[PDB]
């Protein structure tokens, strides 16, 4: 003798997919008014966000099936495409270039790295032409068998980034639309998937900097307790291993050149921002990492990796395999220029058991094939002054060598390049659950 009741407002939810809207701290709006993310993420956040702890609530998470990562990736690509949409096209540049070596107080490392090109470019008036000159990095020109063209002179739609637009990462918050909620897992040593027991609900995620890098994550959030190793299948060598550090390893990158940004008119209201003469001596761009700190960080990573392979496991590190420059070297966009740093000096130690700084050389290229797309490219304008960049490493991306044999000497070399992984190393504690307040249950009472 029991009868159906209908309850509205029941606290239940189900896993669901929805579109999350961005939000940022409005206090940095005026300072970052021209920023892409400040412009798009105009919705102000709560000045003091509050999270509701769910006592006695066990929830299952899976960072490698998270639709929030896909949503963030699509939003980021859309943001970049929109920001480059109204800016000037550089199709007039694709002309034969008369280039000669710089060879002006250059060091040994930069011999042949820079070229001094001159060419005929359109002017304000359609029927007049001007001869100008500019400096291009060797990765931005191809010889024609002195005559050079750009890399994608005749095969990609090169678009100049608007110089005033700032691409600096700023924290953004992905907030759920009304009717949905975001569950945050707060378990320490959460290995990326499975049940989580310390769960709380939040209307907005913590600040996530949309940082872009390939081999080593930058400006992320440090893990609790020890270094955490995450992978969809640690034994499957085809899957990337996202390692999150519990200690920031400081990196001081620099571009010791006093560049001047020469402004040239292409046409009506269309400007080309060329790299003028280099004031002072020409020295290679490089990044410094503290040697003891990095050695201890690799030691921690090795110790944590040994738990998944064996106590008698020899683990060695190797530099990246072959491939495109975009995926074989550490790359980042700090200061408004795209560095490409050779990380073979970071992964050259066989951890079989148990003031100086390591200097990594870095190349710079202006024509960016961003997002690993073919036929589209961006032309980063040069930045005046010497660039100084300080950034925290907070998470590495490594792939275990595919050793068919015992491979007792496990080899881990940098991989990655999939931007979803970079977004997924921070956006892993969260899932989106749809609220379904209507529910039923039996009671003793019937309608009377």
């Amino acid at each position: 003798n029991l009868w159906v009741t209908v309850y509205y407002g029941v606290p239940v939810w189900k896993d669901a997919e929805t579109t999350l809207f961005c939000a940022s701290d409005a206090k940095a709006y005026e300072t970052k008014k021209h920023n892409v993310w400040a412009t798009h993420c105009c919705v102000p956040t709560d000045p003091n966000p509050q999270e509701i702890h769910l006592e006695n609530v066990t929830e299952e998470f899976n960072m490698w099936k998270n639709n929030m990562v896909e949503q963030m990736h699509t939003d980021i690509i859309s943001l970049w495409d929109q920001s480059l949409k109204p800016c000037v096209k550089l199709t007039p540049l694709c002309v034969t270039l008369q280039c000669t070596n710089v060879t002006n107080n250059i060091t040994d490392d930069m011999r042949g790295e820079l070229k001094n090109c001159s060419f005929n470019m359109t002017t304000e008036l359609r029927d007049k032409k001007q001869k100008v000159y500019s400096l291009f990095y060797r990765l931005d020109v191809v010889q024609i068998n002195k005559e050079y063209r750009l890399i994608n002179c005749n095969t990609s739609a090169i678009t100049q980034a608007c110089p005033k637009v700032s691409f600096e990462p700023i924290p953004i918050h992905y907030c759920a639309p009304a009717g949905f909620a975001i569950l945050k897992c707060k378990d320490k040593k959460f290995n990326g998937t499975g049940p989580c027991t310390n769960v709380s609900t939040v209307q907005c995620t913590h600040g996530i900097k949309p940082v872009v890098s390939t081999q080593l994550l930058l400006n992320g959030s440090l893990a609790e307790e020890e270094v955490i190793i995450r992978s969809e299948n640690i034994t499957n060598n085809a899957k990337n291993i996202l390692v999150q550090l519990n200690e920031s390893v400081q990196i001081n990158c620099t571009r010791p050149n006093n560049n001047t940004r020469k402004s040239i008119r292409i046409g009506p209201g269309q400007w080309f921002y060329a790299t003028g003469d280099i004031i002072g001596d020409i020295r290679q761009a490089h990044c410094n990492v503290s040697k003891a700190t990095w050695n201890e960080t690799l030691g921690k990573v090795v110790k944590q990796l040994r738990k998944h392979f064996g106590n008698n496991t020899i683990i060695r590190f190797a530099n990246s395999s072959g491939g495109d420059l975009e995926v074989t070297t550490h790359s980042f966009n700090c200061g408004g220029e795209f560095f490409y740093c050779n990380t073979s000096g970071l992964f050259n130690s066989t951890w079989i058991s148990n003031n100086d700084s390591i200097t990594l050389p870095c190349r710079i290229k202006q024509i960016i094939n961003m997002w690993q797309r073919i036929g589209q490219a961006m032309y980063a304008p040069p930045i005046q002054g010497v660039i100084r960049c300080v950034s925290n490493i907070t998470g590495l991306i490594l792939t275990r060598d595919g050793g068919s044999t015992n491979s007792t000497t496990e080899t881990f070399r940098p991989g990655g390049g999939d931007m979803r992984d970079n977004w997924r190393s921070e956006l892993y504690k969260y899932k989106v659950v749809k609220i379904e307040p209507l529910g039923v249950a039996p009671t003793r009472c019937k309608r009377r």
Binding site: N1, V6, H40, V43
Partner: protein, 142 residues
Amino acid sequence: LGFLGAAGSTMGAASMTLTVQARNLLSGIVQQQSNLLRAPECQQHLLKLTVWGIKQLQARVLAVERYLRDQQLLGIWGCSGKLICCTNVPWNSTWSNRNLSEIWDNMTWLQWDKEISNYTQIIYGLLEESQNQQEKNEQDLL
């Protein structure tokens, strides 16, 4: 407690204070639209491209439609204007043989949803039939 603070409490305890979720369903919409309009200005930034505007507007419309679906389902069952309503559909032991003390205590609402996810549509159909019969009886009484 909070928006989902009772999510871990037992079904008996969590049935107290259902008002928070029902209120939040639209309070979130109105607060987000208040913080989106006249708070930051920058409306043209939202309308900088059509796609963002249509996405947010479609999200709002779908939220309103889901809320109206729930209210219409409550109305069709004779439960409009109430959070807790008792009906004339007897509970089948087929759907769950557990008694009241087993389920209303030492069990969370999420576990209840997982337990009887199979028979929700059947229960909805039975409630529809029962309220149709009640409406026909009321019309006859006129």
